[PDB]
Design a protein around this ligand. Structure first.
Ligand SMILES: CC(C)(C)NC[C@H](O)COc1cccc2[nH]c(C#N)c(I)c12
Length: 291
């Protein structure tokens, strides 16, 4: 009856994710004070991370608990596609926010004259467009399938929903969906840690007006660096191992490959918790929870 002592932690984590992200969307949707530009991208994340809790985690939970896929050969690929999509759409939006805070911290004038709200919404959709094209289609077109006699065995089996992929895909799909966006995100997230350091460096002047607006605008930039940071810690392991197999299979235990995968799942619930650093958010979550 070990199944009962697991469905609790699983229903618990689904709760944290959903409740938490539904909260973050409401906090921004209600409070006009939280309806900033960057907080639109943050909304996108709250959605990607929500879809995970609502669909990706539930199904993925029954596959670990029962040890067998019970929802057919279709929902297998469909659940896989939503999974890959949500992770692609995330790293891309985090990569946007980096370039955003960069262009908004080095060209304050050009930024305001070019970056509106209706344009940033286009940006958000363009990201979800590329994410689908890149992750969703190649799966639908079965470019991931392997010719291995063992692999061909798992495709004809509806009860088996293992993501057995060839090595050509394994490499390209991980580069495109993760590594390239990650490197870009990291590089730019370091260029914004230098300018945001030189701004608080060449601040022996200013005032309790200009140092207060550099105390709020360095302070959010930290919360973003934490989001980008934690996210990397939860998904970089998984993708390192993912590549290891491409070079040398049977070197990493399958139980572990699933471990690091759930590590990256937990990352969806970690966001709303980190937003409690901001006084605004922290006050907005109390309004809704009826305190
Ligand atoms: C295997 C499964 C149970 C569904 N979990 C997949 C991960 O959530 C996401 O893994 C990825 C995310 C984004 C792009 C990716 N490319 C490849 C490959 N090869 C993977 I694995 C991958």
């Amino acid at each position: 009856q070990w199944e009962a002592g697991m469905s609790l932690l699983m229903a618990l984590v689904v709760l944290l994710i959903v409740a938490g992200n539904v909260l973050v969307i409401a906090a921004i949707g209600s409070t006009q004070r939280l309806q900033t530009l960057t907080n639109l991208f943050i909304t996108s994340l709250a959605c990607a991370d929500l879809v995970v809790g609502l669909l990706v985690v539930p199904f993925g939970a029954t596959l670990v608990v029962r040890g067998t896929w019970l929802w057919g050969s279709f929902l297998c690929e469909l659940w896989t596609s939503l999974d890959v999509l949500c992770v692609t759409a995330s790293i891309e939006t985090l990569c946007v926010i980096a370039i955003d805070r960069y262009l908004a911290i080095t060209s304050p004038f050009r930024y305001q004259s070019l970056m509106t709200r209706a344009r940033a919404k286009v940006i958000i959709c363009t990201v979800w467009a590329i994410s689908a094209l890149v992750s969703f289609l190649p799966i639908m077109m079965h470019w991931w399938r392997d010719e291995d006699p063992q692999a061909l065995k798992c495709y004809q089996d509806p009860g088996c929903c293992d993501f057995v992929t060839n090595r050509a895909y394994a490499i390209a799909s991980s580069i495109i969906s993760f590594y390239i966006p990650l490197l870009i995100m990291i590089f730019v997230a370091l260029r914004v840690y230098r300018e945001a350091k030189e701004q608080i460096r060449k601040i022996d002047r200013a005032s309790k007006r200009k140092r207060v607006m550099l105390m709020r605008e360095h302070k959010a930039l930290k919360t973003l660096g934490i989001i980008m940071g934690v996210f990397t810690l939860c998904w970089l392991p998984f993708f390192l191992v993912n590549i290891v197999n491409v070079f040398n299979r049977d070197l990493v235990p399958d139980w572990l490959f699933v471990a690091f995968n759930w590590l990256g799942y937990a990352n969806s619930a970690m966001n709303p918790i980190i937003y409690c650093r901001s006084p605004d958010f922290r006050k907005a979550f109390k309004r809704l929870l009826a305190f």
